[PDB]
Symmetry: C2
Subunit: 348 residues, 2 copies
């Protein structure tokens, strides 16, 4: 006999993008759950090898609970689902019906990682509900929107709002960035971060995020400086709606020369004794070491490059230099601001 939340629950797939995008929307989902006053089922994060990673393996449940009411996916499946969310009542929630690429619907389980995510917790949907007629959908930005959610999907009939995709803005709104202070790395991640730092990174150290795979270069070469709209996390350095300047290809994709000059500069600025590099592809260790040869310091990376432990290391750095467009860099910026530790971005 489990006593469940009378207001009910939200559960969702963090089904868009890599970890950067997933954390970016997760901040919004926390706000949305708080605003609706429903318990948030903490997601399994998704990694592409498909691997589901429990929230609690990465971040501390105790800490996130200081923002809003939460349960782990483990608690939800074992303790909550059996008494309030039987298989006959499992409905998925999306904006509008869509054509499968099956009747018109959300297609919550079509493709990867959509299907694997829900299959991980033995969930099949027996119907869809739509929220497009609630003004702003999940924004809660508009008058009567919050109440329409309560009106349209009452907890008795709808104890679980299960979302096909994260019910949150992408990219995240400035108002949710500070929620990052409630994402505290797990003990395992923090131990690993500390071990690496003591083993390889003489203090003070500069940590850098480099983004340079072909997919990334393609997005950067599309930038329109005349319209100058946000791209991914670009507002982190340029302000809301870019009121501070123009997003350039130099900012999105700094050249090897631009990277090396700016690293040498930042090392000089703080009298750094080591450099840490995290990258999606080219860590430029050999080129950076060649550049820092006169300072008698070296650059170090993780092998293999553990995404989560690298974020934690960058969070602990004496100085962080990130890529302004990258949501992965945005995790670091927000942690350093709120979890203020000095940060900088390439080309700004």
């Amino acid at each position: 006999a489990e006593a469940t939340d009378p207001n009910g629950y939200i559960v969702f797939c963090p089904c868009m993008g890599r970890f950067g995008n997933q954390v970016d929307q997760f901040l919004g989902v926390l706000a949305f759950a708080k605003a609706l006053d429903r318990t948030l089922v903490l997601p399994n994060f998704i990694e592409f090898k498909t691997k589901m990673i429990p929230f609690e393996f990465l971040f501390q449940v105790g800490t996130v609970a200081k923002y809003t009411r939460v349960v782990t996916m483990q608690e939800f499946t074992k303790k909550i689902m059996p008494t309030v969310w039987p298989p006959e009542k499992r409905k998925a929630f999306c904006w509008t019906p869509r054509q499968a690429i099956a009747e018109p619907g959300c297609h919550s389980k079509e493709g990867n990682p959509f299907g694997p995510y829900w299959d991980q917790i033995d969930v099949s949907f027996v119907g869809d509900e739509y929220f497009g007629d609630i003004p702003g959908g999940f924004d809660l930005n508009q008058m009567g929107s919050r109440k329409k959610w309560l009106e349209k999907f009452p907890s008795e009939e709808y104890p679980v709002l299960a979302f096909s995709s994260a019910p949150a803005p992408f990219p995240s709104k400035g108002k949710v960035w500070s929620i990052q202070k409630y994402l505290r790395w797990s003990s395992r991640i923090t131990e690993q971060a500390k071990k690496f730092i003591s083993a390889n990174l003489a203090k003070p150290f500069v940590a850098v995020h480099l983004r340079n795979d072909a997919d990334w270069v393609r997005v950067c070469e599309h930038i329109d400086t005349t319209t100058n709209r946000p791209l991914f996390a670009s507002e982190q350095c340029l302000g809301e709606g870019h009121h501070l300047g123009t997003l350039t290809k130099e900012i999105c994709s700094p050249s090897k020369q631009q990277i090396l000059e700016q690293i040498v500069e930042k090392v000089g600025s703080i009298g750094a004794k080591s450099v840490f590099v995290a990258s999606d592809k080219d860590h430029m260790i050999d080129e950076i070491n060649e550049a820092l040869k006169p300072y008698e310091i070296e650059a170090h990376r993780q092998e293999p490059d553990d995404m989560y432990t690298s974020l934690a290391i960058m969070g602990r750095a004496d100085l962080f230099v990130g890529n302004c467009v990258s949501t992965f860099s945005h995790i670091v910026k927000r942690e350093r601001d709120h979890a203020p530790r000095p940060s900088a971005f390439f080309g700004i």
Copy 2:
């Protein structure tokens, strides 16, 4: 030098479902274009063999123009696109960014028939815009929604609103059904309809729509009579929100016996001299002929079964017996009501 509409244009893919669903949303799109006061680019309809069928091959442009301002796809590509919609300005419009199954976006051209549709008219998108923050999206149902469309997407910057999917409710709202009176079959279709009738269908004739492929049977066996919500076109026989009765599996998927009894009954009722059958699969010609043997009349079908000419034939029938759940049957019902000719449905 073409003088174009200062208010601009709407173009869309009828990217959901077979022709029934496509016409169902098209009625809504006509209303939406009318409400926004933008010229509607008439779609190419989609058939799965992927084949694009020009609007004007099926329906009369003159007739639809009596509802709202329209141009054919041919006019749009040759006369309009070159002066107001250059490749650099071709943006797609959807509710929210989504994950491709590519950066987050509408993915207007991912899969089939999405990609082939836009490739048919040589359109590639260079960016996405979202409309989820306009209350109700394309509903225009809500106060300030119409004006937010005008405010957010002005014709100067946005001369073409190009939609990834039809910007219309599915299933269609009762308020749009009467718009079907502005869909008048082309001369080619009507000639073919008449030829078949004179050749095979002694008057008066009963026309029947039969739906029975495996995919269909699967949807019908999911019906919940206790919640009794609309399914596809079911409101055509049961009223808005089913205020008239309960949608049953008998209505959705009538048995062979139920079909045969009800056909014999309807033939009796009007002293019918022939039967016409249109089906997605089993036309039951041999079983129906066995049943009508005592009336000395026969059932006839088209070979191969031309979807469009069959709808036109059913529209002209002395009595139509349709499937209440089917949007294909709903085309017939609405034509007979508005284009009132007698209609009936199996199991009601």
